[PDB]
Every structure is written in structure tokens, then in C-alpha cells.
Amino acid sequence: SMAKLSVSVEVPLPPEQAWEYASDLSRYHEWLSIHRAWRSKLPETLEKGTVIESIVEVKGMLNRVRWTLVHYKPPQALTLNGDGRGGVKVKLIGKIKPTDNGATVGFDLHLGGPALFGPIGMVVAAALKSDIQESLNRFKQLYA
């Protein structure tokens, strides 16, 4: 078990559209502020077990992360495990749910591994809360 942060946005989009945009990895660089590089070729189709590598920046720190799709259920849920260099271990639970006026796109992000159990974890957690929320706001601005 690990501590976690939670972020969400409501978009004026039906869930199937919100899913299409949220899983369009080729456009993450237009709204995900922490993304810095892809380090493996992006697949045409995602599936449970898909593995992708990227480099992210959080509060000025770079980290190369291997992402594994451990749950994949369009158009409503995905879970991604991340193993970063230096002892970073994260789990990203994504959920897309229909609402009255569109759909919510929210994430629970568990932050762990030795690196984030240590004193830097609350720095990283606070920075990620802001960065991911701002990114979701950009997602909404770009796609809706």
C-alpha cells in the first residue's frame, strides 16, 4: 500500500470521446506538462500488458519511467504501473465516468518506492497535484 493523491476534471464530452482523447498518447505533449520524451515507439493499440517508456520532469527532476498497462477497460478505466529509475514506484488509476454535462476524467496516483517513501515524497506529491491538475485543465481547454 502507498499514499495517494487524486485529481479530476469534468469535460463537456461523452465518455467515448473523452476516452479517445485521454488514451491518445501521440498528443500527450500538447497537454501533459510533465512529459519530456518518449523512449519507445508508441503502439497503435493499447492492451493489458502494453509497456511504454518515457522521461518526465517533476519539480525540476527528470526521471525515466517504464509504464505497464495492468488494467485496460475502455471507455471507463485503466491502471498503469510505473517503475522509475532511482527507486520510484507509482500506480495510476484512471477513470472516465459519464455525468449530466459530459464526463469526468480523474486519476488516483499512488506514489512510492524507496525514493518517494523518503523525505522528498511530500514535495513530489504537492508538485504532482498541481502539475497534473493543471494538465487536466489544459486537456479540457484543448479538447473541449
Automatic annotation (TrEMBL):
Cross-referenced SUPFAM superfamilies: Bet v1-like (SSF55961)
InterPro entries named in the record: Polyketide_cyclase/dehydratase, START-like_dom_sf
Database matches in Pfam families: Polyketide_cyc2
Protein's name according to its UniProt entry: Toxin
Organism: Mycolicibacterium smegmatis (strain ATCC 700084 / mc(2)155)
